[PDB]
Design a protein around this ligand. Sequence first.
Ligand code: HEM
Ligand SMILES: O=C(O)c1ccc(-n2cncn2)cc1
Ligand SMILES: [Cl-]
Length: 393
Amino acid sequence: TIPHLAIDPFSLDFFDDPYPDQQTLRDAGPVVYLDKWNVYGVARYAEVHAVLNDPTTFCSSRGVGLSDFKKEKPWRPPSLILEADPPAHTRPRAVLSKVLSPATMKTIRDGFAAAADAKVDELLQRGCIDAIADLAEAYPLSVFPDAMGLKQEGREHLLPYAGLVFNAFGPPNELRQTAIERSAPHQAYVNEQCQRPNLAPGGFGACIHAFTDTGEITPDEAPLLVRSLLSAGLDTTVNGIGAAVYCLARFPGELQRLRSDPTLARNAFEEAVRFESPVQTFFRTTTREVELGGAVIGEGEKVLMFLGSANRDPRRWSDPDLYDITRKTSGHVGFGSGVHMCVGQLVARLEGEVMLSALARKVAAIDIDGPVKRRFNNTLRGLESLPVKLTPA
Ligand code: HEM
Ligand SMILES: O=C(O)c1ccc(-n2cncn2)cc1
Ligand SMILES: [Cl-]
C-alpha cells in the first residue's frame, strides 16, 4: 500500500539538486517508506502540515533527528524546548517567546537596521564580494552574538557548533559522524557561554536567566535554553539571508520590484524562506498507530517531513517554483507550524527585512560573477560561496 523508495534525502546528489526527487516523493503518494533509512516520509504540504499540528501523535521528545531517544543516547543533553512535548514544552516555550517577543524587537530594531545599512555601504565600496562570507555570514555575526550578550572571544565556534547541531539531526552518515568527531571544542565553548556570569546584561541570554525567578523555568534550565538560541538562531539566519540574496541575484525582475517599493522587503524575505527553505527537513516519532493520508503507520516509527518540498507543492502553491516577492506567503512551513513553530521567527524576519531594505535602497544590480558553491548539511540548505558584483543605486 505504501510505496517504497530508494531515494536518500541525505545524500550529496540530493542536496545538489533536491527538486526532482522531491517531486518523485510527492507524486509517489501522501506517505512513502524510505528503505535507505527505515523511516516514513511525507513530502506534500497537506501531510507535512497535518503532522506538524498533531504533536501528541507525532512527538518531538524522542528526537527530531533520525535517532530515537528511546533507543539511542542523544549526542548532547536534549533541548528543553525543541526535544520536548506538551506539557513539558509549554513553559520553556513561553519564556523564549517572551525573550524574543514583539515588544523585544523594538529594543533591537534600530541597531539591527543600522548594522545592515553599514554592511551594505561597506560591501558597495568593494563592489565584488562573496554574498555568503561577506554578507549572509558577516551581517548576522555582526548583530546576533552581541544581542545574545556573548563576549568577543571564541565566536568562531558558533557557526561550527550550529552546523554540528543540524548535521546531527541526520542519519549516521559521514557528514554526521565527522561533525560529532570534531565537536568537543565547540561544545565546550558553547556550554560555558550559557552560564549566567558570561552573558552581558540586557541581552537575550541574561533575559533567559532573569526568567528563572517567575516559576516558569528554574535556574538549572536557563543554560540549556541559552544553548537553544545559540544552536538555532545563527546558521539558520545565515542561510535565510543567503537564500534571499541568491533569489534577488537570479531573479533581477524581482530585485527591480523590491527597489521600486522597499516596503516589500519583509515579504521578499519571507518568500525567500519559502522558496529555498533553509531548514529542509526534520523528524517526528509516532506515539501510537496512526492513519495519515490513507496509510497506517505503527507506533514508535520515525517520520521524515520535507518542509522545502511542502513549500513547493503545486497542490498548495500557484507557480511554486517562481520567486514572487508579492506572493501571499502565509501558511508556508519554512518556520514550521504549530506549537514548535520557530520561536525566533521575529528575530529572523527582522534581520532579513532590514538587510533586504538596505539592498533595496542602496543597490541597483546584483550579478553573479563567479562559481557558485553549495554548502552540504544533513538538515540545512544553503550556499558556501556566492560571488556577486553589487552595483550602487
Ligand atoms: C530564517 C531563519 C530561521 C528558520 C528558517 C528557522 C526554522 C525553524 C523551524 C522550521 C523550526 C521548527 C522545528 C520543529 O518544529 O521541530 C524552528 C524552531 C526553533 N527556532 Fe528557528 N528558524 C530560524 C531562525 C531562528 C532564530 C533567529 C532563532 C532564535 C534567535 C530560532 C530559534 C528557534 C527555536 C529555539 C526553535 C524551537 C522552538 C520550539 O521547539 O518550540 N530560530 N526554527
Ligand atoms: O533548542 C535547540 O537547541 C534547537 C531548536 C531548534 C532547532 N531547529 C531545528 N530545526 C530548525 N531549528 C535546532 C536546535
Ligand atoms: Cl553542547
